[PDB]
Amino acid sequence: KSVKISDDISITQLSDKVYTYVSLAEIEGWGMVPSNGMIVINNHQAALLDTPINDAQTEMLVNWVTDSLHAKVTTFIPNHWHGDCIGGLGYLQRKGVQSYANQMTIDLAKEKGLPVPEHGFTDSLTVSLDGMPLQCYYLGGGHATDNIVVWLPTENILFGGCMLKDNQATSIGNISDADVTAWPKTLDKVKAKFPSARYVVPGHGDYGGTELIEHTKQIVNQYIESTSKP
């Protein structure tokens, strides 16, 4: 599977230009919790999709991109406003990395005093990494009201983020910012929009293929039934 690049960070290469990382960080009362993200590389320029929970781990990751990939991190896109998405944005901004996100994520970050991504979109936005398309789509609420997905057309790889659960997952998880009623519909749109997905990376846990989508949908619907009757 992966390769360690820190005592807490491991990385898995999915394609010549795409890698997915696993960042482990302690969360009070849950021990070391892993969160996923992506590193996309084109012409020695890199895009980081989600940051680890803090600056320190984000800096480790970016230093690896420089030291081992000989790439400069120029681009950043977060899945949503949670920590496993923008926990390291303060460091990236100190470093001059440009950012793009769902306009909803920007409003939420501003409202909450968190580091704020620069450019906001409402429907879709294809960020060009020196000619390589990183297609960002907001298809509706799910795990978080502002959650988006990032599709890499040239690679057939989808970083669906936290709205998607890994195959070993059995619970809906943290729903404090979720839109459980919209969530199954959002998954339906994801399924239909990216039928050629070869790799599908969730916000936490092992990546897989398109089955993660149906897997997640069953979890949300089971959650809905469980908390509705009797």
Specify binding-site residues for Zn(2+). 80, 82, 84, 143, 162, 204
The contacts of residue 156 (CB under 8 Å, 6+ apart) are 196, 197, 198, 199
DSSP strands (E only) in 103-162: 119-121, 124-129, 132-137, 149-152, 157-161
Q: Please choose which of Na ion, Zn ion, a copy of itself, none residue 162 contacts, taking the beta carbon within 5 to 8 angstroms, the exact cut-off set by kind.
A: Zn ion
Instruction: Point out the catalytic residue in the list 36, 42, 82, 102.
Output: 82
What is the spatial distance between Cα 104 and Cα 84, in angstroms, rounded to a whole number? 17
CB of 102 to a copy of itself, least distance (A): 11
Among 81, 121, 151, 183, binds a copy of itself (CB under 8 A): 121
Spatial separation of the C-alpha atoms in residues 112 and 25, rounded to whole Å: 22
- Is 44 tagged catalytic? no
174 contacts 193 by C-beta, under 8 angstroms: no
Quick one: 14 or 114, whose CB is closer to a copy of itself? 114
Binding partner selected for residue 67 from a copy of itself, Zn ion, Na ion, none, CB under the kind-specific 5 to 8 Å limit: none
**Known binding positions for substrate:** 165, 174
Task: Name residues whose C-beta falls within 8 Å of residue 6's C-beta, 6 or more positions apart in sequence.
Answer: 57, 60, 61, 64
Which residues 180-219 are close enough to bind Zn ion by CB under 5 A?
203
CA neighbor of 65 nearest in space, from 19, 7, 134, 98: 19
**Residue among 41 and 201 whose Cβ is closer to Zn ion:** 201
Whole-number minimum distance, CB 204 to Zn ion, in Å?
5
Beta bridge partner(s), residue 72: 45
Q: How many CA atoms lie within 13 A of 230 on its CB side?
A: 0
Specify the residue, 146 or 155, whose C-beta has the smaller distance to Zn ion.
Answer: 146
* Known catalytic residue at 80: yes
Is 165 among the residues known to form the active site? yes
Residue with smaller CB distance to Na ion, 79 or 210: 79
Just list the catalytic residues: 80, 82, 84, 143, 162, 165, 174, 204
Using CB under 5 A, list all residues that contact Zn ion. Answer: 82, 84, 162, 203
